[PDB]
A paper describes a structure:
Bacteriorhodopsin is a light-driven pump that provides proton vectorial transport across the cell membrane of the archaea. It consists of 7 transmembrane α-helices (7TM) with the retinal molecule bound covalently to the Lys 216 residue and belongs to the 7TM protein superfamily. As part of one of the simplest energy production mechanisms in the cell, bR is of great interest for bioenergetics. BR is a widely used model for expression, folding, crystallization of MPs and X-ray crystallography.
Since the expression levels of the native bR, SRII, SR1-8bRΔ(0–9), and bR0-9SRΔ(1–8) correlated with the stability of the (-4, +47) region of mRNA structure, we introduced into the wild type bR gene two silent mutations (C9A, G12A corresponding to amino acids Ala2 and Gln3) that increase the free energy by 6.2 kcal/mol and significantly reduce the stem stability. When we utilized a mild detergent for solubilization of E. coli membranes and the non-denaturing protocol for protein purification, bR expressed from the optimized gene retained its purple color. With the wild type bR, D85N and D96N mutant proteins we set up nanovolume in meso crystallization trials which yielded crystals within 5–10 days for all proteins. The crystals belonged to the spacegroup C2 with three monomers in the asymmetric unit that form a trimer. Typically for in meso crystallization, the protein molecules form membrane-like layers, with purple membrane-like packing within the layer. Despite the absence of native Halobacterium salinarum lipids, the intertrimer distance is essentially identical to that of the crystals obtained with purple membrane-derived bacteriorhodopsin. The structure of the protein and its trimer is also identical to that of purple membrane-derived bacteriorhodopsin. Data reveal the essential features of the structure, including the retinal cofactor and the hydrogen bond-linked cluster of water molecules close to the Schiff base. The growth of the first highly ordered 3D crystals of bR expressed in E. coli and the similarity of its structure to the structure of bR obtained from H. salinarum show the aptness of the presented approach for the expression of bR and its mutants suitable for all scientific and industrial applications. Our work demonstrates that bR expressed in E. coli is readily crystallized by in meso approach and, therefore, native lipids surrounding the protein are not an absolute requirement for growing well diffracting bR crystals.
Author numbering:
A (entry chain C): 4 to 231
B (entry chain B): 4 to 156, 162 to 232
C (entry chain A): 4 to 232
The structure:
């Protein structure tokens, strides 16, 4: 397990997601309000799933080798299995906060599925050039998501009660800033250009993941915005 | 890319699904009615997902080789990844149009999953004879879905007329899929892969973009 | 098809899930109550999905080989593809009976996904010791589910009409008993310690599966509890 330099970040990630899950689990005990139960369920599931995928990477299961650019490249595919479930859950937290229309929720979840799915195909693609075609489609989907979060129902948040509008705006900002970093890290890291070593890329995703999951959840579950 | 003769149909499919997606995206802008939003979201996602899977097939990612009949057979598995998501969305469009009960929506989506899932298992199965067992199970699931669309469902006249048209389009186009599979490279191998690819492309664009044009052009999508 | 000794149990499972599916399909015909329609849809899909996965195992498609402990180990991965969909559906039946809040349903479905997903990872893991780490995580998720069924639903079912309360308690007990057996069979079977041969393990899972699906469904769909109003 300790052979590759990035093991320490995978271990740390596993530990932080695990601790985060247990905290949210305990914190959610006794909560009887139906709306709050939804938020605790969603928000506890996110780092619980991430925990399993961090462990998969730590133990070697979530790592494969993909040929491109004339070499065999180490790819952690477990990330996508994590994000496939956790990113729409995070979007669901936001959508519930502002009471979004079901059509808008479906649009977000589907666009997010496309984003992660094309990211995965890009990550596993054996023809170097095509990798970035997938990256571009995935980024278009992300920009669509960010557009909806800002110009999609941001008006609905404003016309909610102050505690909701306020918590939403904070979490929206966190989301846009943190999520926007992912395509950059992918682009300069091992999946893409190979400018940053895998060790550092893994550290970067770990810091992003923990912030976007546990950080995000702390802010959300600490707020009275979750109560109906 | 140009190495496989079917590339031209995969390229055309990619372009038409993409163009269709962009059109539905723009057309859906500034739509505020909750029900209409639902239909636009569903109907826009359909060719968006199909666009990605056509591109996957065009670029070679969504192609594999399955041994059966003593040979190595080219199988585009990407189709099932597409249909797994897009066919239930299309059924959802129809179900919402008639305000179907949740139990019925679950039955349709579930049967559809079984249809595509067994289709995929058949497509990847290495014993030639068994491939057709899976085809028969999948076809039974399709027949169940068709039965429900005709017998398993009192609505305003715009809704009733758009539904009937979309249902008939669906029943006719979907029924062609099992035939194309049976005679094509996945089944008997009577029709060569480049022609089969052309056939699925015409069917897919009609069942997705054509279907969507009829639906999103109708007043049926707006909630009284 | 008869080349592996467990074939007979896979054939029997296929037939029992198939028959159960056809019986539930026919029984559900003409049911117009919206609530009952949900229960029939859920409950019929369960054995229908199980039927396809039993057939996949029977035909050899849902079998792979995984090296660990100095052997090539036969692993039926099709079980996880089955359980991934059928276990959440079974949980859904229970949740609807007691009119569970959405948040509780999502918690159950999410925990169930983790249970099956980590079970699958454990099943395919080539480092022998790590297989049991996954098993333990999966078992933790199962225990969480069982906790919810007892300290979330049993409380919400008691405050319901008597037919419902009664049918739920039976189905809850059937579920807790049967589901608890799965991690044990896995642990001592081919996926784990290898104390019980594969043919016997397949018999065990078949009896459990048929009871947990068709048995469960027979108890549920016979009850008046599936009707609303
Ligand atoms: C070259 C063609 C490019 C096509 C790219 C394929 C898709 C990948 C990238 C972005 C699109 C993904 C989001 C589509 C769903 C939008 C729902 C639209 O509906 C919306 C609701 O009405 C809002 O509530
Ligand atoms: C030889 C055995 C074959 C077993 C069939 C499984 C594979 C082939 C599939 C056939 C159709 C499956 C439909 C299952 C949904 C039943 C919903 C039940 O009904 C539903 C509500 O009641 C209606 O709203
Ligand atoms: C040291 C590492 C250990 C970390 C544990 C990893 C978790 C894997 C096993 C089980 C986790 C499943 C619980 C997630 C759902 C709880 C939502 C909470 O629901 C909430 C609502 O109020 C309930 O209705
Ligand atoms: C909870 C994650 C920490 C696991 C670290 C594994 C240590 C391996 C040392 C050999
Ligand atoms: C409604 C949810 C649909 C999920 C989108 C599926 C993602 C497609 C994969 C593209 C690669
Ligand atoms: C009251 C706040 C303390 C909660 C402990 C959270 C569990 C540890 C997870 C790591 C937090 C990283 C934040 C970014
Ligand atoms: C309700 C959703 C369940 C879908 C069943 C898919 C099963 C695939 C069969 C192979
Ligand atoms: C206007 C949308 C452009 C995509 C072409 C779709 C053609 C429809 C086929 C019926
Ligand atoms: C007619 C019911 C389907 C046949 C299988 C019966 C087995 C019940 C298991 C308890
Ligand atoms: C909303 C519930 C969906 C989450 C399912 C999580 C499955 C994760 C698989 C773990 C390996
Ligand atoms: C009163 C109902 C008790 C059900 C538990 C059955 C125990 C089975 C033994 C294992």
């Amino acid at each position: 397990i300790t052979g590759r330099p990035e093991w320490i970040w995978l271990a740390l990630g596993t530990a932080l997601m695990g601790l985060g899950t247990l905290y949210f689990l305990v914190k959610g005990m006794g909560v009887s309000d139906p709306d709050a139960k939804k938020f605790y369920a969603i928000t506890t599931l996110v780092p619980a799933i991430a925990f399993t995928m961090y462990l998969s990477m730590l133990l070697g299961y979530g790592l494969t080798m993909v040929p491109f650019g004339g070499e065999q490249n180490p790819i952690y595919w477990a990330r996508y299995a994590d994000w496939l479930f956790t990113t729409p859950l995070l979007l669901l937290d936001l959508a519930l906060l502002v009471d979004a229309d079901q059509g808008t929720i479906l649009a977000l979840v589907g666009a997010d599925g496309i984003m992660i799915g094309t990211g995965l195909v890009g990550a596993l693609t054996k023809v170097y050039s095509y990798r970035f075609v997938w990256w571009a489609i995935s980024t278009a989907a992300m920009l669509y998501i960010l557009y909806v979060l800002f110009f999609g129902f941001t008006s609905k948040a404003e016309s909610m009660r102050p505690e909701v509008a306020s918590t939403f705006k904070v979490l929206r900002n966190v989301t846009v800033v943190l999520w926007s970093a992912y395509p950059v890290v992918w682009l300069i890291g091992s999946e893409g250009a190979g400018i940053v070593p895998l060790n550092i890329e893994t550290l970067l995703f770990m810091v992003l993941d923990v912030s976007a999951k546990v950080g995000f959840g702390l802010i959300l579950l600490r707020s009275r915005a979750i109560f109906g």
